[PDB]
A paper describes a structure:
In this context, we recently reported the characterization of a novel xyloglucan utilization locus (XyGUL) that confers Bacteroides ovatus, and species harbouring syntenic XyGULs, with the ability to utilize this abundant vegetable polysaccharide across sampled human populations. Here, we present the three-dimensional structures of BoGH31, BoGH43A, BoGH43B and BoGH3B, expanding our knowledge of the structural determinants required for xyloglucan degradation. Our analyses highlight key adaptations in these enzymes that confer their specificity for xyloglucan oligosaccharides, while also providing a rationale for the maintenance of two divergent genes coding for GH3 enzymes, and similarly two divergent genes for GH43 family members, within the same PUL. While we were unable to determine a structure for BoGH3A, our structural and sequence analysis of BoGH3B has also allowed us to highlight further potential differences between these two enzymes encoded by the operon. Together with existing biochemical data, our analyses of the three-dimensional structures, and various enzyme-inhibitor complexes, of BoGH31, BoGH43A, BoGH43B and BoGH3B provide molecular-level insight into the stepwise breakdown of xyloglucan by the BoXyGUL.
Residue numbers in the entry: 25 to 531
Write the structure that this text describes.
């Protein structure tokens, strides 16, 4: 048996893992998206199932006012000690955020606690449980790493933060984790940046408090030295040890199109870690995270496939569905028209930093088909609803039903650099159901419509123009249902009977 990387696709950056007996749990960063910090579950490190989110409530994910793509939830760390799971991270820019927080749970599916604010703004806070102590390791935004000890109950520092080590020469020392393995305490961290020079490095000491000395086989993992490789910007790893004693790393990376641009976001990868004779870890001979590997020494456990169609025919919204900042439940219902997701477009659109009536999911494949049957009668030109390809608040493609010159129409509208650049309309019948459809390849999104007396490819757009390299920030594309009255509320609701999502990267 083998597996193909990546192990979790679509926007899933900054992976943090822990093993609790036969079960593995993993979290990734979410930024402005709610619920925050999804928790995935596996029994083989390869097949992952979404089971909850660490931040499923507005009191533990305050997001209002945060910037798209550079605000909200940054790298989380996930750990487990004495019947209790802990997730620590940083919230930047949300009204009511005090910076670094953690939340706890007995069940990793939830419910999680309200935040325990630790009282600083350090990025990439990490925790580890060693010798009956809860260590807190973070960078100091000045090239150095700070270690401290923390009371699990209160989040207060019992031993205060102090400098113990620093980065090893590379840009933006990030993502430090603390491990006690054999004779030594190890600080493993990321350097180089967000780009091609990203790498994981390690150092160790006889004592937690230093001094630390660098690995002679740095880096631990990087695709820096293979510019041909289909995976790039590999880094921000977290280690996990199995019951057979062997070691695996999860880390983030990108899958560029023609080696130039990435739009799906930073995804999660899996690589075997080997320790050399002197006690230093490395992935392979060269540190390169490969496309396929021999399977972990664990029994294969494939999860029941999620169906293509969400029929919106139960009271509980599927866990993959995602909102922008803190959603008011007043804009959506699965109750009010049973069998449909009812979306009520408000005055709010993307141009502010609160929560527009948007519900979407991560584009988890280059090649896909996404479609939705929607009932929407607009009464005036400002009113619209349909599907959106979102990169951020300034960059998104809108496949919407609206009213133009007393005709109900289907519209593809391309917004880039916060300006509308292209708009193409086709006339719909005055009433009746409309199937809106978005199909994707590595390079192109194609937008299609179907109704009574109306079926047509409406337009195309580039994946390149929504890519990280053009738009900046720390996110990747979401495809979602959308309604907005652009200054006014929509008169009528937009009712989505179903939503198909088909990933086709295997073929
Ligand atoms: Ca339905």
């Amino acid at each position: 048996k083998t597996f193909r990387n990546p192990i979790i696709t679509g926007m899933n950056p900054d992976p943090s893992i822990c093993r609790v007996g036969d079960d593995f749990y993993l979290v990734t960063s979410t930024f402005e998206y709610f619920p925050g910090l999804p928790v995935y579950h596996s029994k083989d490190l390869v097949h992952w199932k979404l089971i909850g989110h660490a931040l499923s409530r507005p009191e533990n994910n305050p997001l209002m006012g945060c910037n798209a793509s550079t605000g909200g939830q940054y790298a989380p760390t996930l750990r487990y000690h004495d019947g209790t799971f802990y997730v620590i991270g940083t919230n930047y820019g949300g009204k009511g955020s005090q910076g670094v927080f953690y939340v706890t749970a007995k069940n990793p599916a939830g419910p999680w606690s309200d935040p325990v604010w630790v009282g600083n703004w350090y990025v990439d806070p990490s925790i580890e449980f060693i010798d009956g102590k809860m260590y807190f390791l973070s960078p100091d935004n000045q090239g150095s790493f700070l270690l401290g000890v923390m009371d699990p109950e209160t989040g207060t520092f019992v031993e205060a933060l102090r400098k113990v080590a620093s980065g090893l020469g590379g840009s933006s020392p990030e993502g430090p984790h603390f491990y006690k393995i054999g004779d030594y305490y190890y600080i493993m961290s990321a350097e180089g940046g967000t780009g091609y020079e990203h790498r994981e490095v390690i150092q160790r000491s006889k004592s937690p408090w230093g001094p630390y000395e660098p690995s002679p086989v740095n880096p631990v993992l990087s695709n820096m030295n293979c510019p041909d490789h289909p995976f790039q910007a590999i880094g921000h790893a977290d280690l996990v040890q199995l019951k057979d004693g062997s070691w695996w790393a999860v880390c983030l990376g990108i899958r560029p199109v023609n080696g130039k641009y990435q739009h799906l976001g930073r995804e999660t990868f899996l690589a075997p870690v080997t320790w050399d004779a002197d006690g230093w870890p490395k992935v392979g001979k060269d540190g390169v995270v490969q496309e396929t590997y021999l399977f972990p020494n664990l029994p294969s456990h494939v999860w029941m496939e999620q169906p293509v169609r969400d029929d919106f025919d139960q009271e509980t919204l599927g866990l993959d569905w995602t909102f922008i900042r803190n959603p008011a439940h007043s804009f959506w219902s699965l109750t009010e028209k049973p069998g449909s997701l009812r979306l009520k477009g408000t005055a709010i659109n993307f141009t502010t930093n609160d929560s527009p009536s948007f519900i979407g999911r991560r584009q988890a494949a280059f090649n896909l088909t996404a479609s939705a049957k929607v009932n929407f009668i607009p009464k005036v030109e400002n009113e619209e609803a349909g599907l959106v390809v979102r990169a951020d608040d300034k960059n998104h493609y809108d496949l919407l039903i609206t009213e133009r010159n007393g005709q109900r129409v289907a519209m593809i509208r391309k917004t880039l650099k916060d300006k509308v650049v292209d708009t193409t309309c086709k006339e719909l019948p005055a009433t009746g159901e409309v199937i809106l459809s978005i199909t994707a390849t590595e390079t192109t999104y194609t937008f299609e419509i179907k109704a009574a007396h109306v079926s047509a490819i409406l337009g195309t757009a580039s994946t390149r123009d929504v890519s990280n390299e053009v738009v900046g920030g720390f996110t990747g594309v979401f495809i979602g249902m959308y309604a907005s009255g652009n200054g006014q509320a929509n008169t009528n609701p937009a009712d989505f009977d179903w939503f198909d999502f088909r990933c086709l990267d295997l073929e």
